[PDB]
Design a protein around this ligand. Structure first.
Ligand SMILES: Cc1ccc(C)c(OCCCC(C)(C)C(=O)O)c1
Ligand SMILES: Cc1ccc(C)c(OCCCC(C)(C)C(=O)O)c1
Ligand SMILES: CCCCCCCCCCCCCC(=O)O
Ligand SMILES: CCCCCCCCCCCCCC(=O)O
Length: 581
């Protein structure tokens, strides 16, 4: 209205406003120390409060984009520190705003953030809670300058909950450390998913995006009508396109506007939105993105009527193909919330191929008559992969599951580096955890969401140490072919066992006192190495060498002459194994 800064202040509230302003500057002034940022926040906050007191006070009618840039431009070492960024200040708005968007830093070469000791954290949290929370807010934002600010704030609030609860329990570290572990992983996945969505919008184009969204929205809002779903999809395409361009306030406005539309139209969308639609602006859109699926309408027709039997299949289709294809997607997805989106895209692509062929025939009905038979194999390939894999995760536990993967994937592509093999296999294990805990109906969606980041991370690592043609092929396959391509790779039978290195298999009882995390990685590294030298070992025959180590490392670790037990029985464990494999 009259004062944008006043409006935002009154809507977010002071606490939220302060945290968001800190995030906003942190992501642009990535090198300025925490103290300089607290300074800007307080200066910006004092000015806001003057505009809340009196909306027509001086400078209160300036745009928030204008006020943000001005404040960026008053930083004294701007030219010194950020170089080219300072030349943005020589421009008029809106070219100045656009100039700042281009000069952030994806890789600020800052040191790794080190998790202090539990008691060092709980005493810092008790002493100056705000200073403690906000510094960590600063450190994350400057390292993820593209992370959507409100989402980062919601994480911060969770961090607060964990420290509040655990810094008072008997075993602090037992309470706090799994929580820190979950939050970090979930924040890393959210960050990768955000950048991957924008990368996918450019790589694959707007058609692919609309197809994906139709399917997803139809699963979540099965009672909505096609036209309403398609109207939602049109807007979300704008929103994602704006957000990916990078301007935080424009992204926030577009998201907030969509949430308002949806909340003013719950009757046409979903019966599960009531609670989200009571929450304050800051949380509404995030709440909606996570709402559970509506119950689908009872007693829906077979898709056969409108898509196989009807006389006007080919006539309906040729009039507007993507509309007709999107109605198919809509009708299939609403009945199938248990499917992955990509599966639904494979079915729609199958239907599209058949109509392209058969609508040219003299008797289209005769040609496309058996099109639904073509769906059965596509549906069962990923259901079988889920059922089977999730049986093993229920049958081994995370760690042993992880070990089974290491063997499988090293045997498949034994040229991949050991750290990549280890990182990715461990992550795949964690996909098991997040997803096999869900009932059938939620399995394929869960696996799809997390696989997409895990497999992407594997591909990104792979572009930079390319050892395998077959891996490269799957990383540059189509959207729908990527995961099936991975699943299809055969064991490398034409491989050459890796040269033996005595040191690689040598443990120096360093092992008995390491964190369990490190003990796992070390065991897992060697397991990979084991398989890299002896690729031809058999299931039951490997379990042999593995169970030698099982007992070995246990007896040479019980306090005593550790040092030479790992020197003696070790050369004894190496030698027995080479001849046995
Ligand atoms: C092919 C492609 C290209 C670009 C993007 C962003 C894609 O993801 C769709 C966004 C998913 C959405 C709509 C946010 C949801 O699940 O609610 C897919
Ligand atoms: C660590 C690594 C190295 C090399 C490859 C090829 C990997 O592929 C993982 C495919 C995962 C999936 C889709 C669940 C499957 O097994 O079918 C993994
Ligand atoms: C310098 C002022 C920067 C202020 C940025 C904070 C406003 C962004 C949050 C808007 C609330 C969330 C909207 C939404 O995503 O639904
Ligand atoms: C290795 C553990 C990962 C979790 C269990 C395997 C999941 C199989 C994936 C099936 C669905 C993938 C999505 C798709 O391509 O349709």
């Amino acid at each position: 209205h009259k004062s944008e800064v006043a409006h935002r202040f009154k809507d977010l509230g002071e606490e939220n406003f302060k945290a968001l302003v800190l995030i906003a500057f942190a992501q642009y002034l990535q090198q300025c120390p925490f103290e300089d940022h607290v300074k800007l926040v307080n200066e910006v906050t004092e000015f806001a409060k003057t505009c809340v007191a009196d909306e027509s006070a001086e400078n209160c009618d300036k745009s928030l984009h204008t006020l943000f840039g001005d404040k960026l431009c008053t930083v004294a070492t701007l030219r010194e520190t950020y170089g080219e960024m300072a030349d943005c200040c020589a421009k008029q708005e809106p070219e100045r705003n656009e100039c700042f968007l281009q000069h952030k830093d994806d890789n600020p070469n800052l040191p790794r953030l080190v998790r202090p000791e539990v008691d060092v954290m709980c005493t810092a949290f008790h002493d100056n809670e705000e200073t403690f929370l906000k510094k960590y807010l600063y450190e994350i934002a400057r390292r993820h300058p593209y992370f959507y600010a409100p989402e980062l704030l919601f994480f911060a609030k969770r961090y607060k909950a964990a420290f509040t609860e655990c810094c008072q329990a008997a075993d602090k570290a037992a309470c706090l450390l799994p929580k820190l572990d979950e939050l970090r992983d979930e924040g890393k996945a959210s960050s990768a998913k955000q950048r991957l969505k924008c990368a996918s919008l450019q790589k694959f184009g707007e058609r692919a995006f609309k197809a994906w969204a139709v399917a997803r929205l139809s699963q979540r809002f099965p009672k909505a009508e096609f036209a309403e779903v398609s109207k939602l999809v049109t807007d979300l395409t704008k929103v994602h396109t704006e957000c990916c361009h990078g301007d935080l306030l424009e992204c926030a406005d577009d998201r907030a506007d969509l949430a308002k539309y949806i909340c003013e139209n719950q009757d046409s969308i979903s019966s599960k939105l009531k609670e989200c639609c009571e929450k304050p602006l800051l949380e509404k859109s995030h709440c909606i993105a996570e709402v559970e699926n509506d119950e689908m309408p009872a007693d829906l027709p077979s898709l056969a009527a409108d898509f196989v039997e009807s006389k006007d299949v080919c006539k309906n289709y040729a009039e507007a193909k993507d509309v007709f294809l999107g109605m198919f997607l809509y009708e299939y997805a609403r009945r199938h919330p248990d499917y992955s989106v990509v599966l639904l895209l494979r079915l729609a692509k199958t239907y599209e191929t058949t109509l392209e062929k058969c609508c040219a025939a003299a008797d289209p009905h005769e040609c496309y008559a058996k099109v639904f038979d073509e769906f059965k194999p596509l549906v069962e390939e990923p259901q079988n992969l889920i059922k089977q894999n999730c049986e093993l995760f229920e049958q081994l536990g995370e760690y042993k599951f992880q070990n089974a993967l290491l063997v499988r994937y090293t045997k498949k592509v034994p040229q991949v580096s050991t750290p990549t093999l280890v990182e990715v296999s461990r992550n795949l294990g964690k996909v098991g955890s997040k997803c096999c805990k869900h009932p059938e109906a939620k399995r394929m969606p869960c696996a799809e969401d997390y696989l997409s980041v895990v497999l992407n991370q594997l591909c990104v690592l792979h572009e930079k140490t390319p050892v395998s043609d077959r891996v490269t092929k799957c990383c540059t396959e189509s959207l729908v072919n990527r995961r099936p391509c991975f699943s299809a790779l055969e064991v490398d039978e034409t491989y050459v066992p890796k040269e033996f290195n005595a040191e690689t298999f040598t443990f120096h009882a360093d092992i008995c006192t390491l964190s369990e995390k490190e003990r796992q990685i070390k065991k897992q590294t060697a397991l990979v190495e084991l398989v890299k030298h002896k690729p031809k070992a058999t299931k039951e025959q490997l379990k042999a060498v593995m169970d030698d180590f099982a007992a070995f490392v246990e007896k040479c670790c019980k306090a005593d002459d550790k040092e030479t037990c790992f020197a003696e029985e070790g050369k004894k464990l190496v030698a027995a194994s080479q001849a046995a494999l």
